[PDB]
C-alpha cells in the first residue's frame, strides 16, 4: 500500500493527515509552564492520530509504533512550533493565543537557550522559504527516523519496511523540488540542507528533555492500541 | 575559495587529511579513554585545518565549530574503525572493548549500544571510505552553525555535490543517489544524538582556550 504511492499521492496523504493547530486556554510568567504543558498534552493526542495516517506507520507492530513516537514526540512538537513561528520573527507561536518572545522565555529557568535555538531554526526555515509540502515530509521523516537505531527476524522486517518508507519520502521531497523548478544540483543541495536541520532538531529535543526532566510508554500504547469497535 | 576544487580533488584532499589511528597509552577504563580522546583531539585540529574551506573562517568560528563537533567526530571515527569488529568498539588497536566492559562504567552501556548499532548500520549500507570522509567534514561544518554562515553553507553544498558524484561514479541511478544521500545524512542525526547523550554522561562524571592553543603548532 504505502510503498505503491506516487509522489503526488504521498504529498496528499501527508497534507490530509495534518493535525489541527490547537489553542491555549481562554496569562502571567508563573502560569506559563502550566499552559505549555497543557498544550503539549492535548497536542500529543492529535499526534497519535496523525502518525497512524503516515503511510506505512500502522504496518509496524504496536511495540515499534510506541518506540518511534516515544523517541520522536518532542522533535515533532518542536518542528511544528518552528513551522508555526516562521512568519513571526523573534517570536514563538506556541498557539495563536500564546505568542511568546525571548524575554518571556527568560522567566522559566533553563529555557532561553532552547528558545534561542528554536528561534534560529524558524529563521532558517524562513530564509529557505520552506513550503508546507516540504514541512510535512520532514515531520514524517522524524517520526520514522528518530527511533530506528534504538530498537529478531520480525524486527529485521520492520526496519527494512521503515527504510523503504523513508526512501519514498525522499523521492517525494525531490519531486516537490523538481516541480518547483529547481535544477538537479539545487534539488540535491536543498534535500541535504533540510535533512541537516533535522540534526539540529534532534539536538534541541535532547536539550529540551534535560530541561523538562529538571522540572510515557504506557500512555502511548493506550492511545495507539485502539480497539476496532 | 575551496569552492573551485572538483569533486575528485575534494575527495583526494579529504582522504589525504585523514588523521592517524592512535594507541591507548598503557603498558581504569575511563582514564584510558580520556587520555586517548585528549590526544586524538590534537590530530583532529590538524585534520580540520585541511578540510577545504575551514581555514577561511575566522579563528573564533574555527574554534566554535570544533568545540561543537569534537565528540561527534570522535564517535563517527570510532564507529568507522569498529565496522569489522561486530559487538565490539575499537577505541584503539590495543583497546578493543565489548558491552560488558562498557557496562562496567555506570551510564555508558546505553551509548555503547548506540555506537554498536551505528557501526552495524554502516556495515549494512557498505559505507565507503570516500563517503565517510565527506560525512566527517559535514559534521565539522554543520554542528555549530545554529557572510560567514553563507560561506559555511556554500562549502556544505560543495560536499553534497561531491557525495552525489561518488554515488554516480558507483553507477547508482539518480533515484538511488538521492535515496543514499538522505540515508547518510539521517545517520548524522543519530550521531548528534549519541554526542548529546555522551556529553551528559561525561559531564555527570574552557575548551575554546585549549583549541586556540592547539592551532598554534
Ligand atoms: O514547553 C513545552 C513543553 C512543555 C511540557 C512538555 O511535556 C509535558 C509532559 N507531557 C508528558 C506526556 C507527553 C506529552 C508531554 C513538553 C513540551 C514546549 C516546548 C519546549 C521548548 C523549550 C524547552 O526548553 C522545553 C520545551 S516546544 C513545544 C511545542 C509545542 O507545540 C507545545 C509545547 C512545547
Ligand atoms: O569514552 C570516551 C571519552 C572519554 C572522555 C572524553 O573526554 C575527556 C575530556 N576531554 C577534555 C578536553 C577536550 C576533549 C575531551 C571523551 C570521550 C569515548 C567515547 C564515549 C562513548 C560512550 C560514552 O557514553 C561516552 C564516551 S566515544 C570515543 C571515541 C574515541 O575515539 C575516543 C574516546 C571515546
DSSP H or E segment with residue B37:
helix B29-50
Phi, psi of A222 (to 5 degrees): -55, -45
Cα(B160)–Cα(A188) distance, rounded to whole angstroms?
Answer: 7
In the block, which residue shows the cell 499521492?
A9
Cα(A58)–Cα(A51) distance, rounded to whole angstroms?
Answer: 8
Cα(A194)–Cα(A182) distance, rounded to whole angstroms?
Answer: 15
Measured between beta carbons, the chain A residues lying within 8 angstroms of B186 are 141, 145, 166, 195, 198
Experimental technique: X-ray
- What Cα–Cα distance (Å) separates residue A159 from each residue in A64, A169, A210, A221? 10, 15, 28, 20
- Take residue B121 and report the three cell numbers written for it: 548500520
Residue A183 CA neighbour count, 13 Å, CB half: 3
- Paired with A100 in beta bridges are A92
List the beta strands (DSSP E) in chain B.
88-92, 95-98
Give the residue among B148, A83, A127, A133 at the shortest CA–CA distance from B156.
B148
- Paired with B97 in beta bridges are B89
Q: Report residue B199 CA to chain centroid gap.
A: 15
Give the domains, in start order, of chain A with CATH numbers. Answer: 2-224 (1.10.565.10)
Q: A158 CB contacts (<8 Å, ≥6 apart)? A: A60, A61, A64, A151
Neighbour tally for A191: CB within 10 Å? 23
Rama region for A54: left / alpha / beta (φ>0; ψ in -120 to 50; rest): beta
Cα(A190)–Cα(A196) distance, rounded to whole angstroms?
Answer: 10
The minimum CA-CA distance between B189 and chain A, rounded to whole Å, is: 4
* B215 and B59 Cβ atoms separated by less than 8 Å: yes
Cα(A59)–Cα(B46) distance, rounded to whole angstroms?
Answer: 48
Q: Report residue B99 CA to chain centroid gap.
A: 22
Q: DSSP letters along A171-200, please?
A: HHHHHHHHHTT--HHHHHHHHHHHHHHHHH
Phi, psi of B92 (to 5 degrees): -155, 165
Give the residue among A177, A187, A79, A90 at the shortest CA–CA distance from A133.
A177
Phi, psi of B90 (to 5 degrees): -90, 75
No. of helices (H) and no. of strands (E), chain B: 9, 2
Cα(A154)–Cα(A157) distance, rounded to whole angstroms?
Answer: 5
Per-residue b/e over A135-149, b at no fewer than 16 CB within 10 Å?
bbbbbbbbbbbbbbb
Q: Report residue B132 CA to chain centroid gap.
A: 8
Q: Which of B37, B90, B119 to mutate to test the pocket of ligand 2 (most atoms within 8 A of CB)?
A: B37
> Crossing angle, helix B29-50 and helix B207-214, to 10 degrees?
50
Cα(B142)–Cα(A127) distance, rounded to whole angstroms?
Answer: 17
What's the CA-to-centroid distance between B64 and ligand 2, angstroms?
19
> Residue A199 and residue B143: Cβ atoms within 8 Å?
yes
Give the residue among B71, B205, B199 at the shortest CA–CA distance from A207.
B199
> Crossing angle, helix A132-145 and helix A184-214, to 10 degrees?
60
Which resolution in angstroms does this entry have?
Answer: 1.8
Q: After which residues is chain B broken (C to N over 2.5 A)?
A: 27, 146, 205
Ligand nearest to the CA of B67: 2
Rama region for A226: left / alpha / beta (φ>0; ψ in -120 to 50; rest): beta
> Crossing angle, helix A184-214 and helix A62-84, to 10 degrees?
100
> Residue B186 and residue A202: Cβ atoms within 8 Å?
no
Rama region for A66: left / alpha / beta (φ>0; ψ in -120 to 50; rest): alpha
Query: B66 in ligand 2 pocket by Cβ < 6 Å?
Result: no
Calculate Rg over the CA atoms of chain B: 17
DSSP for residue B179: H
* B115 and B75 Cβ atoms separated by less than 8 Å: yes
Cα(B192)–Cα(A208) distance, rounded to whole angstroms?
Answer: 14
> Residue A192 and residue B181: Cβ atoms within 8 Å?
yes
- Take residue B108 and report the three cell numbers written for it: 555508558
Q: A57 CB contacts (<8 Å, ≥6 apart)? A: A51, A65, A68, A143, A144, A165
What's the CA-to-centroid distance between A79 and ligand 2, angstroms?
30
Nearest CA to ligand 1 atom 15: A41
Give the residue among A43, A46, A44, A39 at the shortest CA–CA distance from A98.
A39
What's the CA-to-centroid distance between A47 and ligand 1, angstroms?
13
Neighbour-count burial of B178, counting CB atoms closer than 10 A to its CB (0-12 exposed, 13-18 middle, 19+ buried): buried
Per-residue b/e over A31-55, b at no fewer than 16 CB within 10 Å?
ebeebbeebbeebbeebbebbeebb
| B contact test, residue of A188, A193, A198, A212 with most B CBs within 10 A | A188
The overall longest dimension of chain B from CA atoms, in Å, is 52
Cα(A174)–Cα(A190) distance, rounded to whole angstroms?
Answer: 9
Amino acid at each position: 500500500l504505502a510503498l505503491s504511492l506516487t509522489a503526488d499521492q504521498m504529498v496528499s496523504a501527508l497534507l490530509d493527515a495534518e493535525p489541527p493547530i490547537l489553542y491555549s486556554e481562554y496569562f502571567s510568567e508563573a502560569s506559563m509552564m502550566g499552559l505549555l504543558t497543557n498544550l503539549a498534552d492535548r497536542e500529543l493526542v492529535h499526534m497519535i492520530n496523525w502518525a497512524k495516517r503516515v503511510p506505512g506507520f500502522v504496518d509496524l507492530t504496536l511495540h515499534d509504533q510506541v518506540h518511534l513516537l516515544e523517541s520522536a514526540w518532542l522533535e515533532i512538537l518542536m518542528i511544528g512550533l518552528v513551522w508555526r513561528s516562521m512568519e513571526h520573527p523573534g517570536k514563538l507561536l506556541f498557539a495563536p493565543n500564546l505568542l511568546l518572545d525571548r524575554n518571556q522565555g527568560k522567566s522559566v529557568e533553563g529555557m532561553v537557550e532552547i528558545f534561542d535555538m528554536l528561534l534560529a531554526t524558524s529563521s532558517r526555515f524562513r530564509m529557505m522559504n520552506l513550503q508546507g509540502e516540504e514541512f510535512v515530509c520532514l515531520k514524517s521523516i522524524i517520526l520514522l527516523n528518530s527511533g530506528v537505531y534504538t530498537f529478531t527476524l520480525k524486527s529485521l522486517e520492520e526496519k527494512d519496511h521503515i527504510h523503504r518508507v523513508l526512501d519514498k519520502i525522499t523521492d517525494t521531497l525531490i519531486h516537490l523540488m523538481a516541480k518547483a523548478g529547481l535544477t538537479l544540483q539545487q534539488q540535491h543541495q536543498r534535500l541535504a540542507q533540510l535533512l541537516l536541520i533535522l540534526s539540529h532538531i534532534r539536538h534541541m529535543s535532547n536539550k529540551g528533555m534535560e530541561h523538562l526532566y529538571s522540572m510515557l510508554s504506557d500512555l502511548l500504547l493506550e492511545m495507539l492500541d485502539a480497539h476496532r469497535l
